[PDB]
Amino acid sequence: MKKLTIGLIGNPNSGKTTLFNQLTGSRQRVGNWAGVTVERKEGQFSTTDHQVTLVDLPGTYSLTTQTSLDEQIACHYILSGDADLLINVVDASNLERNLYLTLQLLELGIPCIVALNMLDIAEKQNIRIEIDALSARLGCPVIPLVSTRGRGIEALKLAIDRYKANENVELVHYAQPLLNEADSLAKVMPSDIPLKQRRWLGLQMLEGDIYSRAYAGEASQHLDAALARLRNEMDDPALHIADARYQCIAAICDVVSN
Ligand SMILES: Nc1nc2c(ncn2[C@@H]2O[C@H](COP(=O)(O)OP(=O)(O)O)[C@@H](O)[C@H]2O)c(=O)[nH]1
């Protein structure tokens, strides 16, 4: 039977293993990622409507590439198109740090559900999150979990059964020239890669990500000239990409967290 395929992704020590184990139980297998010794781990569970294959991905701060294997493994999987959606396990006690990865996933346009974990930890650090406010800004569902107790697991399963395209909201606000160059690069990348993904790959190349150049086909030959123009228009275009992301996250966090 064709199963619904979900990628489980989050920072290290966010409750991803614990969430995975509560969801799949004994119904899991362990192997290795193709051509490396890093453990690949997946399992099974059901919701009301769906039979799910849950693929645990290695913990990572980001999808940007002495960049660990975990990170390239996670990014390569997200970019494959194998998953129908992702569950982004976010540690509510370190929200701003954890949202770097979330934004990366949201800019790629993959259907996403945020599992907001470590809520008790947030609580007793005197922080609470405005959950719908965060959902409104992310353009995707935000489901609160205390996953060691199994709290919100039913609500997470309910959200899987309602999965749909993220709201294509504006997130990071890049200077227009960076967007114009990302688009020029996008235009000449392989036609079968979705547009949002080609535009993401383009911004990553401009930022200095080397792995991304391998997806970009002949965009790779145009990159030096794109960077020549931007250096004439601004100080450190790559730093501007980065600050744009961090401004975005910080502004979200100001409103959502207290
Ligand atoms: N307080 C609390 N602890 C949690 C929660 N989820 C996981 N943990 C614990 O935090 C530690 C790290 O969790 P783990 O699932 O191993 O994280 P992973 O690296 O992302 O796979 C473990 O001891 C878990 O039992 C949660 O929602 N609340």
From Swiss-Prot:
How changing residue 149 to A affects the protein?
GTP hydrolysis rate 1.3-fold slower than wild-type
Q: Where does GTP 1 bind?
A: 10-17
Its annotated compartments are: Cell inner membrane
Consequence when changing residue 120 to N: Loss of guanine nucleotide-binding specificity and Fe(2+) uptake
Annotated region (NFeoB, GTPase protein domain, binds GTP but not ATP), positions in chain: 1-258
Give residue ranges for domain FeoB-type G. Answer: 3-166
Instruction: Tell me where on the tree of life, at the top rank, the source sits.
Output: Bacteria
Induction info:
Iron uptake is repressed by the global regulator Fur in presence of Fe(2+). Induced by hydroxyurea.
The residues that hold GTP 3 are 56-59
Deletion phenotype: Poor uptake of Fe(2+).
Provide the binding site for GTP 2: 35-39
List the Cytoplasmic topological domains.
Answer: 1-258
Q: Show the disulfide pairing.
A: none
Q: What is the effect of changing residue 151 to A?
A: Dramatically reduced GDP release-rate, in construct of residues 1-270. GTP hydrolysis rate 2.7-fold slower than wild-type
Binding positions (GTP): 117-120, 146-148
Q: Which family does it belong to?
A: Belongs to the TRAFAC class TrmE-Era-EngA-EngB-Septin-like GTPase superfamily. FeoB GTPase (TC 9.A.8) family.
Protein function? Transporter of a GTP-driven Fe(2+) uptake system, probably couples GTP-binding to channel opening and Fe(2+) uptake. A guanine nucleotide-binding protein (G proteins) in which the guanine nucleotide binding site alternates between an active, GTP-bound state and an inactive, GDP-bound state. This protein has fast intrinsic GDP release, mediated by the G5 loop (about residues 149-158). Presumably GTP hydrolysis leads to conformational changes and channel closing.
Quaternary arrangement and interactors, per the entry?
Answer: The isolated N-terminal domain (residues 1-274) forms trimers.
Q: What is known of its domains?
A: Contains a guanine-nucleotide-specific nucleotide-binding site (about residues 1-276) that shows slow GTP hydrolysis. When a non-hydrolyzable GTP analog binds to the trimeric N-terminal domain, it induces a structural shift which opens a pore.
Q: What is this protein called?
A: Fe(2+) transporter FeoB
What organism is listed for this UniProt entry?
Answer: Escherichia coli (strain K12)
Q: What is the lineage of its organism?
A: Bacteria, Pseudomonadati, Pseudomonadota, Gammaproteobacteria, Enterobacterales
The gene that this protein is the product of is feoB
